[PDB]
Each structure stands twice: as structure tokens, then as C-alpha cells.
Amino acid sequence: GEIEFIESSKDAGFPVINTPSKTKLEPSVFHQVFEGNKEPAVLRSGDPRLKANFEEAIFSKYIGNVNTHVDEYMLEAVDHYAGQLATLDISTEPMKLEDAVYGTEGLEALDLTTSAGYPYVALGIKKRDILSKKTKDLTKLKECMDKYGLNLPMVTYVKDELRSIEKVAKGKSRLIEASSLNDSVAMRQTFGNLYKTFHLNPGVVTGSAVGCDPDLFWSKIPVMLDGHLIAFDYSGYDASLSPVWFACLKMLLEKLGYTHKETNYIDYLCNSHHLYRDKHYFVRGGMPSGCSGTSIFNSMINNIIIRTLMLKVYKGIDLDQFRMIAYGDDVIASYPWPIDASLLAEAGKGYGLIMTPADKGECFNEVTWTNATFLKRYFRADEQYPFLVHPVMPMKDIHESIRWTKDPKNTQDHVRSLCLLAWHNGEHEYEEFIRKIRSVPVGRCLTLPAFSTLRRKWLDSFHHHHHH
Amino acid sequence: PNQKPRVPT
Ligand SMILES: [Cl-]
Ligand SMILES: [Cl-]
Ligand SMILES: [Cl-]
Ligand SMILES: [Cl-]
Ligand SMILES: [Cl-]
Ligand SMILES: [Cl-]
Ligand SMILES: [Cl-]
Prior knowledge:
- The PDB classes it as transferase/viral protein.
- The entry lists the keywords coxsackievirus, RNA-dependent RNA polymerase, protein primer, VPg, VIZIER Viral Enzymes Involved in Replication, Transferase-VIRAL PROTEIN COMPLEX.
- The structure holds two protein chains of two kinds.
- Chain A has helices spanning 54-59, 72-86, 97-102, 139-148, 165-169, 181-200, 214-217, 221-224, 237-240, 243-255, 264-270, 294-313, 341-349, 395-402, 411-422, 427-437, 451-461; strands spanning 2-8, 26-27, 39-40, 154-158, 162-163, 175-178, 228-230, 232-234, 271-276, 279-284, 323-327, 330-335, 355-357, 378-381, 389-392, 404-405.
- Chain A is an alpha+beta fold.
- Chain A has three domains: 1-13 and 70-202 and 243-285, no CATH class; 213-242 and 293-368, Alpha-Beta Plaits; 376-468, Mitochondrial Import Receptor Subunit Tom20, Chain A (Up-down Bundle).
- Chain A has a five-stranded mixed beta sheet with strand order 1-10-9-4-6.
- Chain B is 0% helix and 22% strand.
- The chains are: A alpha+beta, B mainly beta.
- The structure holds chloride ion (7 copies).
- One chloride ion (CL) is lined by residues 34-35, 399 of chain A.
């Protein structure tokens, strides 16, 4: 991805986006109880913790584009992955407006708490001023869609979230795009059935984990990925995507039955128009993280990429024996024979991708079930029921999270969520977590689950059939 | 996979 044109918003009539410059994250009541090194990401140029130029850092992931045609390797990769998706019978029929907006099986209701994007943010019009959970009203939305139309600019925000000491110092804060409510809606109508099918079918057929429930999904992963594991990381995946990968994504959707006109929304994601504060700019390539379906599309593209690299490096590869599960850039895969990921990384580099060893490793080492992580979680077989696998979020991560809050009024939900993550670390670690939480008065005002209850409910969850 | 007792996190 690359920035192709920048201008002062006022020269083109756009008002300045008044995006918050102060973090909503504050130290929580548990900040002193637990240890941690993460702090809120830098959100403004003047941050005294900066040790690099902010604006440069944030836009630096737009490393450029490789200007290539869709090659032979890509074509076979698309064909192989389209073959899997075909077995899913994804309907390319538009999703009915109400289903797209207010919720349906496999596609949660449009989040009414996130930004409505442009022009709404400039007019003080919030999603809630247009939409109604209670009434499922669509009259106002339609007025809005007709009045303002589609293909509106995206609003660029700096993601307000915890980051490592090093990422704070380097101003390496993440940018997310707020698609206009009009474009979000039109995209959910166009691809909603694909979103639903993906959400209902995490695994090796969609090659996606988007929308999965790790508590349940983890036990399936080693059944699905039964060869020698393959895993590696990308650096700035989203912004590194060149247009060629979107071209591949468009071919893939066409094989699925989408018309050329329907894939036009992919051009909207690729060659994009943004507002960042007082600037207005155009980008060619790069997935604009935050728009409708970005995790799904990123995941689909990853399926094309990895197959492409294997086909390129290993001419004798048999893709029918390759398996992978992606969540955007995050991947866990397997092949029955050992595969040299450093080789795949060099191939990727020729395609404008930056792949590094898994988990900040120095060498493309062997990935084992002991060291493998996915969605930041390790895999640990239950001691009593070996076929059940615990998703293990490191206690360090749980500690980082508990020390800060964006709204202390949600302490109960926040802590409960962390408890659902923590117990997988074991009874001793859990009792210690709980003891430390209760070492401050707020901790004793909370309804915290008992370990035995967590374990029991986890074991019972595997009893209830799940719709696919 | 590894079991918790055999491997920690
Ligand atoms: Cl601690
Ligand atoms: Cl944010
Ligand atoms: Cl799941
Ligand atoms: Cl990162
Ligand atoms: Cl080969
Ligand atoms: Cl059971
Ligand atoms: Cl299931």
C-alpha cells in the first residue's frame, strides 16, 4: 500500500476531523496490584514519551506496492482456495437490509457504538441517531443512504489501545479506518452471506478463524492441522498488501459467483480516500483495517498468499495436503512434510510482504504444539480429557489488560472476561489471579467465577450441538 | 498438543 496524494482538507471543502488526542485509557484500581509494561499508544505528535516522529511512524506501514500482474502461482492459488470455498455454497444474493443492519444468524448487528464515519461525524450525527435496536427502523438509514450515497471517504483514527514500551517510544500506533455508515451497510448487503458463512464455519475449509470462540475452537485445530506445523508473523500486513493481492481477491470472488460490479467494493478498499484530522489523502493498495469485512478479506487474501508462496518455492507441493487457518494476518498451518518458512519469507518479500519468524523469534525455528500461538494463545491439552485443548492466554497479557481501563463503570465485565481467559492457565495461577484481584476492595465487590464453575461449564459446552 | 503439566506458558 502507498499514499499517492495528500492535501489540506480545507482546500477541498472537508472540515477537520476532530479526533480525540487524549487516551481514554487510565490506570485501573488494579494497576498497582499487578505488573506490566504496556501503556496507552501515542495518539498525538506532542506526546512526551515519543522518541521518534509520530506522523512518520503511523504512516510508515505504507511501504509501497510491487507493480506486478497476477502471476501463474497466484492463479493456481486462487483456483485451489476457490475449490474449497465452493463446497460451502456461499450465496452471492444480497443480504436483506434488516438482516445486514440489525443482526441475523452468523452476522451480529451493526455495532451502534462505533463511528458512523463521514459525513456524519462532521454533522454530529451518531449511528444511534439513525438506527434503532428497539424499532429496527430503516427509514432514516435509507434517507441517509440516498442523500449521501456511496464511496464516501474513510475517516482515519489512531487506535487507542495498550502498546509495548518500544512501540510507544517509536510512535508505532495503529491506524484504523471508519468506513461511512453508508458504505458499511452496502458492503454488508453485498457480502453479508459470505460473512455469515465464514463466521459459521471457522476452520480449514474457509481457512478462517474470524468469529471463532477459542474455548470451543482450540480443540478442533489440532484435529484439522495434523502435519508439521507452519507459522510465521507478518510486519504491517494490512498496509503492505499491494493491489495485485486485491486483484487476486476479486478473481476469487468472481469464481464464487459475484459479478464484476459486486467486486467493485474491493476497489473501494484497495484504492481508497481518507480524512485524517486536517488532511485528505488517497492510498493505492493496503487493506484499510476497520472497514466492513476487513478481517475476512485479509484472511481470504492470506489464503491466496501462502498458497502462492508454497507453489512458487515448492514446485512439487501438493496443496490438497496443505491446511491453514488465518485470522487476518495471523496464521497457523500445516503440511505433511517439513517446510522452510525462511524460504517462503523471501518469496513473500518479492511480493512486497514482510514475514518474520513466529513470535518475535530470531530464526524460522521449528513450530511445535508447545510453542505455537494463534490469537496470542498457546495450546495445552487438558490433563483429564486429552482430546480437549485449552486456549492459553499468557498471564502476562491478562495482567497488562487488567491494569488499565477506558471506563471503570465496566469493571465487572472487564474482569469477568479476563477470568474466562485466565483459568485456562491452571488452578494455582487462577487462585493467585483471584487473590490479587481481591487484594483491593473493588475486587471483593465483584462476582468472580469459581474455578470449578469455569471448568464445569467449559466441559459441558462441548455437549451442545453447534449450527454450521 | 502439550499438556499444561508438561509445558507451561
Ligand atoms: Cl503480576
Ligand atoms: Cl480506538
Ligand atoms: Cl468457534
Ligand atoms: Cl503490531
Ligand atoms: Cl519442490
Ligand atoms: Cl466432556
Ligand atoms: Cl461444534
